[PDB]
Amino acid sequence: HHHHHHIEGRHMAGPDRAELAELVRRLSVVHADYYVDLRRATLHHRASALIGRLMRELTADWDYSVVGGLTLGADPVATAIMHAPGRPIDAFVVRKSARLIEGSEVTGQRVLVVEDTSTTGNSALTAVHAVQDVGGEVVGVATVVDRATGAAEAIEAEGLRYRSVLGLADLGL
Amino acid sequence: GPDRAELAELVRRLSVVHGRVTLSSGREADYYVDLRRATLHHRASALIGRLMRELTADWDYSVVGGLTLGADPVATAIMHAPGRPIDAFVVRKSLIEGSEVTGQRVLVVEDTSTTGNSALTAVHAVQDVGGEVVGVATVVDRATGAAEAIEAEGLRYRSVLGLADLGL
C-alpha cells in the first residue's frame, strides 16, 4: 500500500529529467523483490550533475541562499545544487549527533533542506530543527525521489513545503 | 597561478577563524582552522575541485572519496569539476557508500589532515574491499606529520596548499 504523493517534478518534463530517471533505475534499483540504493546515483558523476540542475529548477520560485540536510544522505544532493550553474548558493551539513551545523552560516538566512529520499520524514524534520535552533529559516524541503511512504505528508503536516523531482513510477516500481 | 591564489585567500578568510578559544587540546589560542567553511562554499569548492584534479592529473583513478565528514565535499567537488568522469564514495566509521571501489583505482582525499589517521582509516577501508589506492590528496597540509605517516605506508601524498598559505 503506497501513500501516493504529488511529484512536482512531473512539470519539468524534458530530456534531463528522463536521463536522470534512467540513471537512477540503472544505478540504484536492483530487481523484497527489489531494493533501492540512491547513494549510487547521488555520488555518480552524471546523475549528480543532473540532480543539481533539476533540484534548482524544482525550487526556482523559492528564496534561499544556503542548502543542506541531515548527513549522510543529504550531503551530495546539497553539494550538487551548490555546484550546478546559476546564482551562488552555499552548502551546509547537519550532523546526526554531537555545533550540529557544519559549513556555511545559516543564522539569519533562508535555507532549503534537502534529502535524497525521505524514509519516515524524521530526518528532514531533524535538519529543520537544527537550522531553526540557530536562527535559520527553512523555506521548504526538496528531495530527489519520493517513494510514497508517507514521509511527504509527515513533513507537510509540520507546516513545511515539500517537492520531489521523481516518484515511484520513475523507478519502474 | 591565479586559481591557487584565489583559493588560498578564500581559505584564510573563511577557515582561519579568529577569536579567543580554548582549543580541543585544552590549550587557548587566537584562532582555529575550520576547512568546512571553505569546502562547503560555492566558489572555494569549485576551485578545490579544479585544483585537486590538476594536482593529481598524472594519477590513474576512476573514484574519489574519504572519511566522513571532512572528505565528502572535497570528493564531490572533484566529481563536479569539469574533466573526465570521476565518481565519488564516502567511508563511514563502524563501510563504503556510493560508487563501487572494489576492483577500481581510487584517490583518497581529506580536507586537512593532522595525524593522517582519518585518511589512513579511509585508505584501509578501501583496501579491505579490494580498492587499489593510488595516493592521498588534501586541500591543506599543516606540517603536522601527516605526510610522513601516509608515505610510511607506501602511498604518495600531495596537497594543494601548505601551512605558509594560511598566513599565520
Residue numbers in the entry:
A (entry chain B): -10 to 20, 31 to 97, 104 to 178
B (entry chain A): 3 to 96, 105 to 178
Structure paper excerpt:
The fifth step in the de novo biosynthetic pathway is catalyzed by the enzyme orotate phosphoribosyltransfrase that synthesises orotidine 5′-monophosphate (OMP) and pyrophosphate from α-D-5-phosphoribosyl-1-pyrophosphate (PRPP) and orotate (OA). Herein, we report the X-ray crystal structures of MtOPRT (coded by the rv0382c gene) in complex with PRPP, inorganic phosphate and an exogenous Fe(III) dicitrate molecule (ferric dicitrate, FDC) at 2.25 Å, 1.90 Å and 2.40 Å resolution, respectively.
An analogous network of hydrogen bonds occurs in the MtOPRT-Pi binary complex, where the inorganic phosphate occupies the same binding pocket of the 5-phosphate group of PRPP exploiting the same hydrogen-bonds network. Refinement statistics gave good correlation coefficient score for the Pi molecule (CC = 0.97). The analysis of the enzyme structures in complex with PRPP and Pi lead to the identification of the molecular determinants responsible for ligand recognition and binding.
